[model samples]
Target chain A: NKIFIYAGVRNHNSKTLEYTKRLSSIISSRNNVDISFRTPFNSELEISNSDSEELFKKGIDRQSNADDGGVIKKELLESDIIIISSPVYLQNVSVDTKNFIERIGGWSHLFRLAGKFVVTLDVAESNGSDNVSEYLRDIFSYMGGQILHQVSITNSLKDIAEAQLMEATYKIEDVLEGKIKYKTTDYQERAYQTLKLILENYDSEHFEKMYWEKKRLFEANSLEEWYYVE
Target chain B: NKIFIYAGVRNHNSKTLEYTKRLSSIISSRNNVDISFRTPFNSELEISNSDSEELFKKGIDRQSNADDGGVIKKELLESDIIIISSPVYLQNVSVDTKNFIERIGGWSHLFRLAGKFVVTLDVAESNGSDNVSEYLRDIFSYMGGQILHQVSITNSLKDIAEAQLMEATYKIEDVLEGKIKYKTTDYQERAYQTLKLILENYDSEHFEKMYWEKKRLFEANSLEEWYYVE
Candidate 1:
């Protein structure tokens, strides 16, 4: 069964509505799929669980491998296909989202999210789309996971949720089906593609080779210019 | 003396030059001013007498500080006005530029650069204008500065230095002489005027209160989302 997971904090903006509402419809349209939307704010923990405080503590403990028993570790192994979404705040991601990513990064190897299909959606009124998308893509890919697609919606006005959700679904389908096309139509695109392709196949040995290749290319002016710390 | 501060690293794409050269012509045109340019490469400890190395170490030593220091710090203090020209890297100032700012932050008490005049020119191929400009502006203003003017160039086409330089010089003159004019009038001008008035009055408490008040408005949405890590 395909697990549909929606991960994000709720906000009042149209951007959030665009995402959650569209997600609701997308889930409704599907059959025989196990649909469960999870977030930092699990209602079970916030409303009924007396351990709201303990809930966060357990999250941190489970993430940091500090749990005495191994049961906490087992839960993480079963979850698959994480859909992480957030609204951009202050030209970057919010503190709430950052804490979540940090936890994920810290425990990425233990949980082994590699091979899991991951997707990201960002909603912002202004600033930081390409860089954020690129960053998320890099992090997920580095962890051995596949980024199904990255989508961003900015300067969101009236009724943008439908379009944003549509684009997101399209990217999700494309990336999952191995139709992930590079979005470049110029010299910059060409240069980026060449480098991106190399990164796609990155390993320690390949990285070292690329380093030396750059060193040789700039030997005359001192390849150190490319690596100058000062 | 006039100074053109190349606020970027040596190995950067050198789009910073596209703006520095433009600033050089305009500042040097002053009767009593002579122009000199400084960049991360030109600011090396081996090349200059300034405490560039020491300043660089201090900033890295304290990550809490803003980045960007060394040659730009000394040069900024010695000059009548500083033109900070750099390309937008990672949606903000390049790492080189950031180091200079942080180093300058370390010596802010000694330099009194808080009240100095500055002009910032950001070069980018697309987007990240207001972000880059506002980021620099915020840093400078925190130091009690007068950012005479700021501009962002979206597309600096290849080998079009002559045309780009001409436009840069015109904008520089408009900023330096306190005779800045807007071709397209808008509410932004009102923002400039109101800010200038506040600066003239220089009420710290009022400014702080206003800043936090605005911040609280955004914070009211406890469910804010984010997609990047800054």
Candidate 2:
């Protein structure tokens, strides 16, 4: 399985990395698991923002693709499992994580990662771990990615990791082995329906238009239509 | 007077921009304001990241300089008034804005904005305006920036801006003329005291130690001593 992990933190060693590394070792020791990684710090995040520089890299406003077909797009599209690991900062994901998430802002509208497996891992010293993990899950949910597992680490669990680890790993292994799959939500579908008209009517970046066109969404006469094919 | 405005949005004409521009025009038509703008999306953000990219760009572990003294430092230090504006994205500041804020994370610890006047402007379609604006104000507050005024706009008034705008302008003008001044808070001072010990004892990158030493925080035997000499 191809895995893409985004370690959200400063270049300094983080407890968050411990979790991802542990998971990676377990999954891999257990090999053939090709993986890649990205960080908003240290490395140049080659994600292109050629057009939009708005909140979510909504280039040119309302453009669905922030990357303009960059490395991130390939990361999401090519990977089999996506692990978004972040250490909480001010009750939210690290700065690097936020930037990475926002750059792919278009995914929410497109449900671009539909059916992809995802895990959101958050580590904080004392508080906000749940909020951070949930936030990550919501974005993946909106992108139509299946949430395999989520874990938040605080000392309440030196204490927390193993319990969280079992559930997370078992679920990933089960899903990877074709033993399970998750479903979508009305909330996400509602988001698609809400944005569908605006995206189609308010075409700006031709890339977003191209994706919708390729999906035959312009021909979607009913709001009940879903963008996913399989 | 110099001003720094960070418009948090994509390039597509945003209501957030609309509010900032109107205020800017009034503030400038009214020029010599010397305001500079930065957005997370389209600008080169000459801000340097020579090191540290943690949650708040803490550079090295426990370091306090995210910009390593770049454009943003100049922007903050040189400006008399700082306006951090943003349009809401997913119940938070625009992706661009979040990145910008995180990059300056050290300011919160160092109280880098000290006596600078700050106005947090949040423009949302209908919700999260208060949440976003307050979040911005809190960061500024921790940096020891005076929260001159904060305005959250949703149509609940086309309605909200004018009432909010006048106060923001008046506060800026007043502060510029030294007609009024705001005081520091226990909340902020507490943050300083809390981090002061850790930063001094658990030094990493040494920049933070430098700031502390320069401020003479290390020599002072009493916790009652403050970092600011003025």
Top of the candidates by TM-score: 2
Model 2: residue A86 alpha-carbon error in angstroms:
2.9
Over A1-230, each residue of candidate 1 has an lDDT whose tens digit, in order, gives 34445444433333544575576467447423444565544511111111111222222333234321232224334544556666553334433344344444333222144446677877765555665576566555544455666767776353665676776666555544556532212332233334445434545344323443443422323212222321
What is the lDDT, from 0 to 100, of the residue B69 in candidate 2? 27
List ranges where model 1 is wrong by over 4 Å: A1-230, B29-32, B45-72, B107-111, B156-168, B171-230
Provide the TM-score of chain A alone for each candidate, in the order shown.
0.55, 0.81
Measured by lDDT, the strongest candidate is: 2
Sort candidate 2 into its docking category.
Answer: incorrect
Give the Cα error of residue B204 in candidate 2, in Å.
12
lDDT for each residue of candidate 2 in A1-230, tens digit (9 for 90 to 100): 78888886654466777777787777777646787766654345532232333433342433234333366578779987898998776667766676577667655456678768898888877776876887788778878787878888886667857778777777778867878755666776676677676676654555666667677656764323453432
- C-alpha displacement of B25 in model 1, angstroms? 4.0
DockQ of each two-chain model: 0.02, 0.21
- Model 2: lDDT equals 0.68
Q: Estimate, for each residue in B1-230, the C-alpha lDDT of model 1 and write its tens digit.
A: 45445555443335566467655755576434655577655654211112222332232223222333344455666765667775664345544454455344444312134335667878775655777788777656544455767767766354564565566565556555656521212332333344345434434444332342333412222111100110
